[PDB]
């Protein structure tokens, strides 16, 4: 028979693509008026009733390890933090000689030498006058020059003090696609991050993603619906990190019990430096606590899921971190504005062979000079928070690394890992992909154009 | 017994539907290509990026419309042509294509001949314009 080309405009066809998504937030942040970086510089109001269309018959290939959404989110968060820090105070004058003594006023043995009482000369609002002041500095934030100390950052760069009016608390962020692009979502319960998905949908915006910055433990994230999920770009390659998603959260209570006082020191015209004035009461180690039974059950489930890839009879070892700097060797996070680094050796100290409120306690240290994003030369100073700090969070996942193993295959040991925040974003964006619409189609019909 | 969906399919709702049935919801995709799914940026990296994306979207939409006009199919969602179908591109009969295939499958099948078809459409439209001018100059 006679067939002719026919053109269709607006056909449902798409290809894998990369683009620039935009971000949306709920009105609640606008009602806080605490100047959240995301709601202030990047995001717009969220749609009251987001649209989700379920694509019947559609099976789509996903790969969470080659998703540009993660890269865009990493770049966006870094840029927003830098932008929020631009108008803040630069602590150049703070790079001076410090005369430091111990703080032995009712301290515990574990907190001996952790805090230092440092006196120094500082500039005033008058360029021709100097003021002798004192402050308390954490042992990690100072280094001995030769009783003489200097700030750790003084030989690398000057730190920018965080503006107390700016809030970095994670508020949910939705990523939304512009014209000509779509976001596809995999709703399979046992989707491992790579391969086909048979239950696909298209969404205007992603679900509320909280950009939580943490290491060795994913906090306040999404949970698996059926069972614990193990995800890795290549499980057999020990050099690739493993992302573990829990089906039930694990409560973690972190606290700084020391009652701290914030003191303002005028270092220039309109320039104030917020230091630690004094400690009211005794000095105790900040610490985190998790239930022993819940952690043991979660580790058992994780081991059960790992044995599907590493053998039903292989011995599984959970050991602490190998080495590196404080950020990677410790569970690092932000509690009420203070930067905690906690020792997780008590969490990964187990053996499994394939055969009640003890409340595991993790000691923690606190830092004020912060190097984020694994960068160098852009240090940030965190002003102290007045009072006693307590936060409660949910461990929803882990980042793990496997040792080489020597190919013996008899045993496998896993250690907490992290550092690169891109894995944290992948833990939430694994189910999303971006596609570009191709609206033009050509097909045969019996329709023929007039002459 | 007939069960009825609450609302029309929506954006990409016919991606898994047959090519014949998907023709009833081309307008939604066409609209999305320009306006997205149915305030002011600030100077900065983020705002500049968004403005670049919007300009790119406008350019892409205009490129598609330019192609349609060049084929003589401007202002139409379904446009018939004078270009005969070559069985080399595909030998499937009409029933298979329009009742047992999706547009994604069809694109996978005939993705190799798309540019050839586009060029043929261009030539046919140009010849149509020339012949129109000559035939109607004879008037």
């Amino acid at each position, epitope marked *: 028979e006679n067939l002719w080309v026919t053109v269709y405009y607006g056909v449902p066809v798409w290809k894998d693509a990369e683009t620039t998504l935009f971000c949306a937030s709920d009105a609640k942040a606008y009602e806080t008026e605490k100047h959240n970086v995301w709601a202030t510089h990047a995001c717009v109001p969220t749609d009251p009733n987001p649209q989700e269309i*379920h694509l*019947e*018959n559609v099976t789509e290939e996903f790969n969470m390890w080659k998703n540009n959404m993660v890269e865009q989110m990493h770049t966006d968060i870094i840029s927003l933090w830098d932008q929020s820090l631009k108008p803040c105070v630069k602590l150049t004058p703070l790079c001076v000689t410090l005369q430091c003594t111990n703080v032995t006023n009712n301290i515990t043995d574990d907190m001996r030498g952790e805090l230092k009482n440092c006196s120094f000369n500082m500039t005033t609002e008058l360029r021709d006058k100097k003021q002798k002041v004192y402050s308390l500095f954490y042992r990690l934030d100072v280094v001995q020059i030769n009783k003489e100390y200097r700030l750790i950052n003084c030989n690398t760069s000057a730190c920018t003090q965080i503006c107390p009016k700016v809030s970095f608390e994670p508020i949910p962020i939705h990523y939304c696609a512009p014209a000509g692009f779509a976001i596809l979502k995999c709703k*399979d*319960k*046992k989707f491992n991050g790579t391969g086909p998905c*048979k*239950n696909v949908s298209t969404v205007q915006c992603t679900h509320g993603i909280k950009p939580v910055v943490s290491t060795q433990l994913l906090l306040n994230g999404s949970l698996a619906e059926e069972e614990v999920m193990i995800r890795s770009e290549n499980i057999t390659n020990n050099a690739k990190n493993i992302i573990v998603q829990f089906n039930t959260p694990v409560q973690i209570n972190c606290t700084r019990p020391n009652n701290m006082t914030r003191k303002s020191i005028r270092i220039g015209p309109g320039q104030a430096f917020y230091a630690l004035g004094d400690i009211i009461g005794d000095i105790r180690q900040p610490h985190c606590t998790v239930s022993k039974a819940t952690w043991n059950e979660t580790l058992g489930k994780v081991v059960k899921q790992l044995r599907k890839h590493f053998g039903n009879n292989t011995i599984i070892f959970f050991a602490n971190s190998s080495g590196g700097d404080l950020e990677v060797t410790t569970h690092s996070f932000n509690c009420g504005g203070e930067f905690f680094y906690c020792n997780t050796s008590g969490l990964f100290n187990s053996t499994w062979i394939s055969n009640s409120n003890d409340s595991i306690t993790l000691p923690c240290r606190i830092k004020q000079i912060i190097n984020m994003w694994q960068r160098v030369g852009q240090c940030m100073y965190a002003p102290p928070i007045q009072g006693v700090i307590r936060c409660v969070s949910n461990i929803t996942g882990l980042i793990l690394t496997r040792d080489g193993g020597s190919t013996n295959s008899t045993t496998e040991t896993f250690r907490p890992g992290g550092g690169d925040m891109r894995d944290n974003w992948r833990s939430e964006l694994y189910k999303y992909k971006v596609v570009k619409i191709e609206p033009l189609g050509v097909a045969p019909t019996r329709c023929k154009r007039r002459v | *017994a*007939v*069960g*009825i*969906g609450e609302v*029309f*399919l929506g954006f990409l*709702g*016919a991606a898994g*539907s*047959t090519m014949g*049935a*998907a023709s*009833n*919801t081309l307008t939604v995709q066409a609209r999305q290509l320009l306006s997205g799914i149915v305030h002011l940026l600030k100077l900065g990296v983020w705002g500049f990026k968004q403005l670049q994306a919007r300009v790119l979207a406008v350019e892409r939409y205009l490129e598609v419309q330019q192609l349609l006009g060049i084929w003589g199919c401007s202002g139409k969602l379904i446009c018939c042509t004078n270009v005969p179908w070559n069985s080399s591109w595909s030998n499937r009969n009409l029933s298979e294509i329009w009742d047992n295939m999706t547009w994604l499958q069809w694109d996978k099948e005939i993705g190799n001949y798309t540019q050839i078809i586009y060029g043929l459409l261009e030539e046919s439209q140009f010849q149509q314009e020339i012949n129109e001018q000559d035939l109607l100059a004879l008037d």
Partner: antibody
């Protein structure tokens, strides 16, 4: 062959809740709609609820059970779930799950429509009992 | 909305005689009928769909004829493995109303 096995039926007090699960095999679960049918003891058959195929975007419930029953599928699990909530003395009966001859979602005029043509294959039976 | 009635309530018939069951609908359905058999203490089976077509997997021992509002189920020779509750169902609307059921037994 096309086999349906039903489970999850026990005893629950009035005003409580119960869940019934049907496992399907021998056919494409996603390609057919499914019905929940109730046989009261010594009485005739009474249709309860139906869910469309695929993603199950369509659900129809009997007026007797409307507002307190919910039907659900799991195509990966090949499971059909009925969420009996706010049970009453008359709900006690034998509940069957049956495969419809059709019910696959269809695109007709840009709309999602389901054509149900009855029940071709039934399960074997699962009894629920309410007491107090 | 659509009321479905089976007559007679029960039937006692000899081995090898015509058995007829009448089905009445309040509103016309005119093609949407299913004939089910539930043997004593067993799951129901589907015999005829659309009121005229026998279901695959069953011998041609049953017939159905009807339209509009009136339908009829006809049984071939009443073999011993034939007793069962015969149900007359409609699928014209989303209610899938069932019939009261008809009890068929052999002479005894």
């Amino acid at each position: 062959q096309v086999q349906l096995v039903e489970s999850g039926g026990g005893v629950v007090q009035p005003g409580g809740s119960l869940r019934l699960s049907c496992a399907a095999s021998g056919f494409a679960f996603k390609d057919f709609g499914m019905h929940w049918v109730r046989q009261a003891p010594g009485k005739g058959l009474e249709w309860v609820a139906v869910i469309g195929g695929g993603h199950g975007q369509h659900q129809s419930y009997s007026e007797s059970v409307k507002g307190r029953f919910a039907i659900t599928r799991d195509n990966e699990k090949n499971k059909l779930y009925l969420h009996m909530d706010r049970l009453r003395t008359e709900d006690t009966a034998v509940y069957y799950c049956a495969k419809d001859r059709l019910g696959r979602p269809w695109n007709i005029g840009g709309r999602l429509v389901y054509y149900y043509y009855g029940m071709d294959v039934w399960g074997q039976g699962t009894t629920v009992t309410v007491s107090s | 909305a659509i009321r479905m009635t089976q007559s007679p309530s029960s039937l006692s018939a000899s081995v090898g005689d015509r058995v007829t069951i009448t089905c009445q609908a309040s509103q016309d359905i005119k093609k949407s009928l299913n004939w089910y058999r539930q043997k004593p203490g067993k799951a129901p089976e589907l015999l005829i769909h659309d009121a005229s077509i026998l279901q695959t997997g069953v011998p041609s021992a049953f017939t159905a004829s009807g339209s509009g509002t009136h339908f009829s189920f006809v049984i071939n020779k009443l073999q011993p493995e034939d007793v069962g509750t015969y149900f007359c169902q409609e699928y014209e609307n989303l209610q899938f109303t069932f019939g009261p059921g008809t009890k068929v037994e052999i002479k005894r």
